[PDB]
Subunit: 95 residues, 2 copies
């Protein structure tokens, strides 16, 4: 299945720290057998609506192909790190 993986990282990291976070993400995708079709580094962005107390984040986006039964494990692995604030995974098609 094709998925979009949206990751929000801590906006306060230096680029050395962010490089490590990005490397970990790519390694996890490969270790879970995902085919990585696009990586977009969106950078520092701010949630405007709805209203959040801490609206800034460092946004990363991935498009991947992988089996549905492996997505949950991958997502939880990605979010275990303290510097990964949010992970959201959307399947590009439905039944």
């Amino acid at each position: 299945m094709r998925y979009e993986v949206n990751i929000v990282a801590n906006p306060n990291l230096d680029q050395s720290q962010l490089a490590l976070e990005k490397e970990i993400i790519q390694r996890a995708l490969e270790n879970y057998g995902a085919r990585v079709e696009k990586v977009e580094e969106l950078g520092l962005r701010r949630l405007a609506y709805p209203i959040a107390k801490d609206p800034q984040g460092y946004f990363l986006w991935y498009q991947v192909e992988m089996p549905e039964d492996r997505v949950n494990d991958l997502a939880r692995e990605l979010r275990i790190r303290d510097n990964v604030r949010r992970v959201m995974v959307v399947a590009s098609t439905t039944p």
Copy 2:
């Protein structure tokens, strides 16, 4: 400011109903003075992670340019309709 507007509509609508929803959105963007730079109709998609009771939605994405002080009003106008389940607006850059 440049914003990404993510809209999740009711996944149970027929295309006649969806056409009306899309027309309303475009009219609202213009009436609020936004410059509409891209419209992407993503269609029926399913949230895979995190886990939601009702994970399917009809996804629409807009990229717009408009003043920051007008975004909140626009977002609330867009979401007032029952068939618009979620609106999320992200500013493409921060201070």
